Design a protein around this ligand. Structure first.
Ligand SMILES: [Mg+2]
Ligand SMILES: [Zn+2]
Ligand SMILES: [Zn+2]
Lengths: 470, 1166
């Protein structure tokens, strides 16, 4: 069954899943719709999700952000946006003071208006993440209060859920259940300092979020379920269209990337296709996914298939230069001149020699040269970056020469010359710098240098150094 | 004393598995991108296979962005892009890493023959791979439910099991699963349980595997490697400069294959992280994981899965494993070869004017070779201002440089070498003599050592740079310091051809000639008589000579006398130094005799006089051979007058037997044998005809009528002296040549009737051609065979070196003359010469000790033993040496280029292998493959079986496949019964007593037997005698020593019988074992000492076992060796030759022995 070579263990593993019926596609897409809209509605039922959007638009008109980073546009321009957001704030400022039973009818509508806003994927992600992290915050206190009773103070969980469900905030459970004279009751006193003080955040969630610990779970739980449904369906679809992916990738074979690489990038393409597809447009999913997969394949190939990466326009530019070569090959009877395809092509046309160069792929350094022997290309590539020893002995010898010759001048001329150049010192120094260091400054030094150079100019000072210039 | 932190001179090396954190420790950055260079500005894209930040600056001491360009700013990390400005060489040093998303198996530990992950987990390979490919689920930490720990399930099975048991059961799949396995593994518990199980049940099949596995386990534990590390979390990346992108001519780029691979790995890995963040379906991410596994594997060692191909090129890309392994079988660069500076080479010429301590070198060559010396010496005297100007001077080739070159050349030796290097004499040192020309001049006497002809052979030259190398070359590699072959004490400086024809022509006597029967005062006026043309070079004459004998105590006796000799011998006597007797030059002076002259001279006068003597012999040889006017004409080859008659008679015989076949008196094959016999006999007749004729036919007159002596004919003198040619070839020149044999090997019954002096027609030549082609083919093949043999030999010996001075054991082998068949195929004197007596020997009467205890037996001792009748001498050998991990000089022998006892620290294993290997081109079941079989200790095809135990025997049971043989010892029991197939004709008497190791059948026998039944000395004796039987039959001289050291290396391993320290059946070093039992006989356990049994391992087998793993990586399969060492965390301490050669430090032998010693003792001590 397993022949190794993962091309197979893939080819066979995907072949199990049966192709979709034309109706089943609609079934799956419907399931997608169900899941998503579920999470959207769950988002609309969160007060903080609304108040956040408001706080964001207050930063949008305040020039701390742009309308593009908040909304992708509504179910529908900056004016229309301003008035739509005004509508949002309107429903919010009504629903807020009606909390005193009848409020619900508006809290429903408050969702609807908020559902008119199509959020940037990033923003939506921020929201959902905030909800789930908030659920982490709830779980912290739930497990703290649980472990501090059951694990530490020895109380059964069976009796622990009794006064829990429905409240888990007020002191009805904490201060009124410890006097019950149960085997686990009087044991609840030891940790009473730790449980009641950490309850601070527990009742705090009903302030920030605007929901009791009851609803907070229900809403985002429904959200989670929706997400699950969605991913389930979408995955199913992709797994159904893998065959299409392979069929596409078979065309791009020798472009310089491996087969399985091609089909994998294509798979990514198909995933994106399922993510962005809408069956409500009556467009066949096959021909729609085809383009996306093809796009992923091509775009990937151009990008990563080279030892030396080249820009997209450059690649296409090269191909354009191949096209001309084809016709003009037989047409001209031998081949078009190096400058022919030049005027044949739009751009400055001298770029041919340039473009024709950078295009070429580097020859494998391990390419065996003749004799079949261990002689391989790279073995013959000499180091030009090294320096010859014959020169290295001179570089060491010059340091003696300039040293003796500098021992020749006056100590201050030697100091000025060793300073004006980097001789046996860090960097070198400006003439003014040499000035400040000598206490004598400006033109003065510039003169001392000349005469110094003058003393080392004529022979018997020079005869040692003059032999150093070839 | 604070020990140290930073760089010291390191000892040993360690190898082991790599931790993710350790891998990160090497890594100075994570390569996050497949990109290499920008595509326009060739600068590296940051965080890529080629990068400035992670690895290093592009150009020396310069930042990438270009902000800090000054050599001052160095330890500075640039603010723009962090690059510490430092030498570009660091880009050849700093490594990197890649954090892999999904876990990955290291293909070296998956696919190594004893799969490491496999046997460590006690799990089969195919299972593990089936798990790695996500083909099935595997259990981990099953707990108590329904299932085993290592058990494997399927989709449906895993589902059902999970449905039954939610928790307290665990199963994973893929690389994560195998990692989880290895990590959950507790080795210690397995150790305890396995010890118990080992102890409980008694079955061979059970406790064998049991003990093997527990040993393996505890070894891996003691290593320090944790199993998890077999699965790679992190993947190290090799420095960019070791896989260069460097450009070429025409703006073209060339890069290694590691970039394609690494780039692939990075790509697939990043794409995997991407697919994770996209929440892809299972199948997709699985395919991606598998692909990642394949990519990583292909990177590490390619060819163990799919053999991935490089971009646009069919040829499979070279992976890191191939980078390490190299090519050409097993060659790791310090093996195959290495380019070397200060060297040269060229065609070679003669140069007889040279003394043997020197040689010619081309002017230009010496100039370019010594160039640095020439510069420094040019400016030392002050002829050149600075080194630059010096270069300008030697470049212009000013007249003043030649003298300076003559200065730097004078006492400075040079090394000369030939292409087929076999024995150490393949490279020799000489004193350079500046010569005008492009050709190298090489002293004639040395032409034998190199095996170099003048037909266009080239020699190479190397300059001994360091002072130590100069003195090494002069005191060791020097020509004059090796006058004797290391294989046998016979001189390798023996005169070759022209010279021996000269000395032969000189001393010889024709019946009559000028000055016949006269008398002369001394050799002076003898020569004066000859040159003036008054007397002939060869005539019988009495002359007075003064000969010396040093027979007094350290003192030369002088005596004079009238010797009956010839003019030529008298002239030649002038050369013969001092204490040599005149007798030596009074003979005909053949090549053998002219060699024994030099020999005796060396064993009498010493080195220097032998050297100058040899030189003079060469000079006079050439001169008088020149004067001789020896030539070769077409009439110099004389055919028998009776040839045609022999041909016709032998031709009558064929028609006799033919008529008999026509009438049916004889069969076809018998006829064939008959005719072939008569033709062979005919060839013998013509041969012994032309031989007698060409030899004695010279018939000349002295004062009487007639007389006849040995011929003065040229070709005869040439063949007889030994200058060149031989009876075999001369036979083919005059008489008919042989009978030829078709490629099948069926010998044609129509021999070649004609010869080379006559014409050969079409058929005869065509028939000869096959013989020629098979000749060249066979020889060219046996060269390679010899090479392979020497290779196996040096590999098996090598590190064996003289270490301790004397082990001091009475042990040794009994040395008797070979005495084969009829008389003495080799004497006792040669076998015992240069060796050392195990114990004192007697005369016929005793309390008179000729040779005391252990003493070197030189020529005088051996001749003193020859005076007396002593037929028996026990001699110390390297095989019996008590010294562990080496041989004591007192055990080895004196043999060397010098007559003195072997030096302390000389590496004997190498020279032994070389000595066995050099003649191997001269060897023809029998033959060279026979030698190869011997050293391999291969059991023959149809062997013989020796008696297991002494005592009366009888035939047991009946016929099924075997008829059992029941042995019956005198006292002890008789459980021993061997099953001998009865379809093989027996030998052993049903009613007779047979000693252990007797002949129970016929045919050759495996030396394993001879070792076990007949003893150690017995088996070493068998090997040495058989191999010497092969060589000596070809006329090859090899001392028993070298063979004996090879033998010692063969038996280095032995399998224990008893217990009390280590395991039962373990094969181990008899050095380790003997040292442990000698140490356990006292103190420790009172005596717990364990018995062993000596084992015989073939050379190629014994070569496998080497402490140093770096050594094993050289000549063995590299891929396996590195792993197999790395798991046990093996620590290579060097201590051997090969390893120290690889690592590039002084050899722990020879000159370096004073180093490694003064070190070795400093180590593991105060
Ligand atoms: Mg030759
Ligand atoms: Zn920078
Ligand atoms: Zn010894």
């Amino acid at each position: 069954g397993r022949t190794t070579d993962p091309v197979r263990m893939y080819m066979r593993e995907m072949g199990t899943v049966e192709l979709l019926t034309r109706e089943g596609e609609i079934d799956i897409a419907k399931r997608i719709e169900d899941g998503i809209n579920q999470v959207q509605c769950s988002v609309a039922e969160y007060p903080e999700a609304i108040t956040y959007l408001l706080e964001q638009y207050d930063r949008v008109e305040a020039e701390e952000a742009r309308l593009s980073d908040l909304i992708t546009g509504f179910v529908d321009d900056p004016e229309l946006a301003r008035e739509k957001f005004a509508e949002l704030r309107a429903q919010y400022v009504v629903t807020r003071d009606t909390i005193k039973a009848t409020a619900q009818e508006e809290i429903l509508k408050l969702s609807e208006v908020f559902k008119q806003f199509r959020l940037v994927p990033k923003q939506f992600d921020y929201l959902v993440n905030s909800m789930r992290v908030m659920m982490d915050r709830v779980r912290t206190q739930e497990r703290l209060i649980m472990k501090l009773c059951v694990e530490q103070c020895k109380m059964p969980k069976k009796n622990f859920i009794t006064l829990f469900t429905g409240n888990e905030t007020s002191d009805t459970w904490f201060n009124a259940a410890i006097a019950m004279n149960k085997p686990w009751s009087e044991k609840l006193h030891d940790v009473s300092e730790e449980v009641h003080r950490a309850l601070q955040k527990l009742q705090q969630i009903e302030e920030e979020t605007g929901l009791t610990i009851e609803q907070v779970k229900d809403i985002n739980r429904r959200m989670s379920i929706g997400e699950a449904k969605a991913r389930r369906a979408k995955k199913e679809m992709v797994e159904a269209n893998l065959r299409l992916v392979i069929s596409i990738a078979k065309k791009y074979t020798n472009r310089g990337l491996q087969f399985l690489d091609l089909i994998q990038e294509g798979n990514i393409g198909l995933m994106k296709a399922v993510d962005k597809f809408e069956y409500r447009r009556g467009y066949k999913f096959s021909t729609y996914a085809t383009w996306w997969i093809r796009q992923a394949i091509t775009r990937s190939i151009a990008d990563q298939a080279r030892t030396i990466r080249i820009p997209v326009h450059m690649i296409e530019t090269i191909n354009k230069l191949n096209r001309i070569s084809r016709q003009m090959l037989q047409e001209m009877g031998r081949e078009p001149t190096p400058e022919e395809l030049a005027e044949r092509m739009l751009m400055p046309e001298d770029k041919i020699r340039k473009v024709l160069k950078i295009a070429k792929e580097p020859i494998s350094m391990e390419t065996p040269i003749g004799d079949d022997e261990d002689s391989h290309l790279g073995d013959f590539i000499e180091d030009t970056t090294l320096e010859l020893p014959l020169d290295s002995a001179t570089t060491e010898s010059l340091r003696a020469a300039t040293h003796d010759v500098l021992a020749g001048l006056t100590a201050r001329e030697a100091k000025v010359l060793r300073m004006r150049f980097g001789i046996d010192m860090n960097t070198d120094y400006t003439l003014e710098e040499v000035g400040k260091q000598f206490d004598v400054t400006r033109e003065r030094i510039r003169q001392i240098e000349a005469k110094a150079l003058r003393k080392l100019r004529h022979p018997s000072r020079s005869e040692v150094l003059r032999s150093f210039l070839d | 004393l604070k020990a140290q932190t930073k760089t010291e001179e390191f000892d040993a090396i360690k190898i082991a598995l790599a931790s993710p954190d350790m891998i990160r420790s090497w890594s100075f950055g994570e390569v996050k991108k497949p990109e290499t260079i920008n595509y326009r500005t060739f600068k590296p894209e940051r965080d890529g296979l080629f990068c400035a930040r992670i690895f290093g600056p592009v150009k020396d001491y310069e930042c990438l962005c270009g902000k800090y360009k000054r050599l001052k700013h160095r330890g500075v990390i640039c603010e723009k892009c962090g690059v510490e400005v430092t030498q570009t060489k660091v880009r050849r040093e700093r490594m990197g890493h890649i954090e892999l998303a999904s876990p990955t198996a290291h293909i070296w530990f998956l696919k190594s023959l004893p799969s490491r992950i496999g046997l460590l987990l006690d799990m089969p390979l195919r299972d593990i791979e089936r798990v790695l490919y996500f083909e099935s689920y595997v259990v981990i930490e099953g707990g108590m439910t329904n299932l085993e720990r290592q058990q494997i399930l399927t989709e449906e099975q895993y589902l059902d099991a999970l449905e039954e048991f939610g928790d307290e059961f665990d199963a994973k799949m893929g690389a994560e699963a195998i990692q989880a396995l290895l990590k959950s593994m507790d080795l210690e518990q397995e150790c305890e349980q396995l010890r118990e199980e080992l102890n409980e049940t008694n079955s061979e099949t059970k406790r064998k595997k049991l003990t093997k596995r527990i040993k393996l386990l505890e070894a891996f534990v003691q290593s320090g490697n944790k199993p998890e590390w077999m699965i790679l979390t992190v993947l190290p990346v090799l420095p960019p400069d070791l896989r260069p992108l460097v450009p070429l001519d025409g703006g073209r780029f060339a890069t290694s294959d590691l970039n394609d691979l690494y780039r692939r790995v990075i790509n697939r890995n990043n794409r995997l992280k991407r697919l994770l963040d996209l929440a892809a379906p299972d199948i997709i991410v699985r395919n991606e994981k598998r692909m990642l596994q394949e990519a990583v594997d292909a990177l590490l060692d390619n060819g163990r899965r799919g053999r991935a191909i490089t971009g646009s090129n069919k040829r499979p890309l070279k992976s890191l494993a191939d980078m390490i392994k190299g090519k050409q079988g097993r060659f790791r660069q310090n093996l195959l070869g290495k380019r070397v500076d200060y060297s040269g080479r060229s065609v070679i010429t003669v140069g007889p004017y040279l003394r043997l301590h020197q040689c010619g070198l081309p002017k230009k060559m010496a100039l370019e070779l010594f160039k640095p010396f020439i510069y420094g010496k040019l400016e030392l005297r002050g002829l050149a201002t600075t080194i630059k100007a010096a270069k300008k001077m030697v470049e212009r080739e000013e007249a003043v440089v030649w003298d300076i070159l003559d200065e730097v050349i004078r006492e400075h030796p040079v090394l000369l070498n030939r292409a087929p290097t076999l024995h150490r004499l393949g490279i020799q040192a000489f004193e350079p003599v500046l010569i005008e020309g492009k050709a190298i001049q090489l002293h004639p006497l040395v032409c034998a050592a190199y095996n170099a002809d003048f037909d266009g052979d080239q020699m190479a030259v190397h300059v001994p740079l360091t002072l130590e190398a100069q003195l090494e070359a002069r005191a060791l590699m020097m020509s004059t310091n090796n006058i004797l072959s290391p294989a046998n004490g016979e001189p390798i400086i023996v005169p070759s051809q022209d010279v021996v024809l000269g000395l032969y022509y000189m001393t010889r006597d024709c019946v009559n000639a000028k000055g016949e029967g006269m008398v002369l005062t001394g050799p002076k006026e003898a020569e004066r008589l000859y040159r003036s043309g008054l007397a002939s070079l060869h005539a019988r004459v009495k002359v007075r000579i003064t000969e010396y004998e040093k027979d007094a105590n350290g003192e030369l006796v002088a005596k004079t006398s009238l010797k009956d000799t010839t003019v030529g011998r008298a002239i030649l006597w002038m050369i013969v130094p001092k204490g040599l007797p005149y007798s030596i030059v009074n003979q005909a002076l053949g090549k053998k005799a002219i060699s024994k002259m030099l020999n005796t001279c060396y064993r009498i006068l010493g080195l220097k006089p032998t050297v100058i003597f040899a030189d003079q012999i060469m000079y006079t040889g050439f001169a008088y051979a020149a004067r001789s006017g020896a030539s070769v004409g077409i009439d110099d080859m004389v055919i028998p007058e009776k040839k045609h008659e022999i041909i016709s008679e032998a031709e009558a015989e064929v028609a006799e037997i033919q008529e008999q076949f026509q009438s049916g008196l004889v069969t076809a094959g018998e006829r064939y044998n008959k005719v072939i016999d008569i033709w062979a006999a005919a060839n013998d007749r013509v041969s012994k005809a032309m031989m007698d004729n060409l030899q004695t036919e010279t018939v000349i007159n002295r004062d009487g009528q007639e007389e006849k002596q040995v011929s003065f004919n040229s070709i005869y003198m040439m063949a007889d002296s030994g200058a060149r040619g031989s009876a075999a070839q001369i036979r083919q020149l005059a008489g008919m040549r042989g009978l030829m044999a078709k490629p099948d090997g069926s010998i044609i019954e129509t021999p070649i009737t004609a010869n080379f002096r006559e014409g050969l027609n079409v058929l005869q030549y065509f028939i000869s051609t096959h013989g020629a082609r098979k000749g060249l083919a066979d020889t060219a093949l046996k060269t390679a065979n010899s090479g392979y043999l020497t290779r196996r030999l040096v590999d098996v010996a090598q590190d064996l070196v003289v270490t301790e001075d004397d082990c001091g054991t009475h042990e040794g082998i009994m040395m008797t003359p070979v005495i084969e068949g009829g008389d003495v195929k080799e004497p006792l004197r040669d076998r015992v010469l240069g060796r050392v007596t195990a114990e004192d020997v007697l005369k016929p009467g005793t309390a008179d000790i000729l040779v005391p205890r252990n003493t070197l037996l030189h020529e005088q001792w051996c001749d003193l033993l020859e005076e007396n009748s002593v037929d028996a001498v026990k001699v110390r050998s390297v095989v019996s040496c008590d010294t562990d991990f080496g041989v004591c000089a007192h055990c080895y022998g004196r043999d060397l280029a010098r007559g003195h006892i072997i030096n302390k620290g000389e590496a004997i294993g190498v020279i032994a292998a070389q000595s066995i290997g050099e003649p191997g081109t001269q060897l023809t079941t029998g033959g060279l493959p026979r030698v190869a079989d011997l050293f391999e200790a291969r059991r023959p095809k149809e062997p013989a079986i020796l008696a297991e135990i002494s005592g009366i025997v009888s035939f047991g049971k009946e016929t099924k496949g075997k008829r059992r043989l029941v042995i019956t010892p005198v006292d002890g029991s008789d459980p021993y019964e061997e099953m001998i197939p009865k379809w093989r004709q027996l030998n052993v008497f049903e009613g007779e007593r047979v000693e252990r190791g007797d002949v129970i059948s016929d045919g050759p026998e495996a030396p394993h037997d001879i070792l076990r039944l007949r003893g150690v000395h017995a088996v070493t004796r068998y090997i040495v005698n058989e191999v010497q039987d092969v060589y000596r039959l070809q006329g090859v001289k090899i001392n028993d020593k070298h063979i004996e050291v090879i033998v010692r290396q063969m038996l280095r391993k032995a399998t224990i019988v008893n217990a009390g320290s280590s395991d039962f059946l373990e094969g181990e070093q008899v050095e380790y074992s003997r040292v442990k039992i000698a140490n356990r006989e006292l103190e420790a356990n009172g005596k717990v000492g364990a018995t062993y049994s000596r084992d015989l391992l073939g050379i190629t087998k014994a070569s496998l076992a080497t402490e140093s793993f770096i050594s094993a990586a050289s000549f063995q399969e590299t891929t396996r060796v590195l792993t197999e060492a790395a798991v046990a965390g093996k620590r290579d301490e060097l201590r051997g030759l090969k390893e120290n050669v690889i690592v590039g430090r002084l050899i722990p032998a020879g000159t370096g022995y004073a180093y490694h010693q003064d070190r070795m003792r400093r180590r593991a001590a105060g």
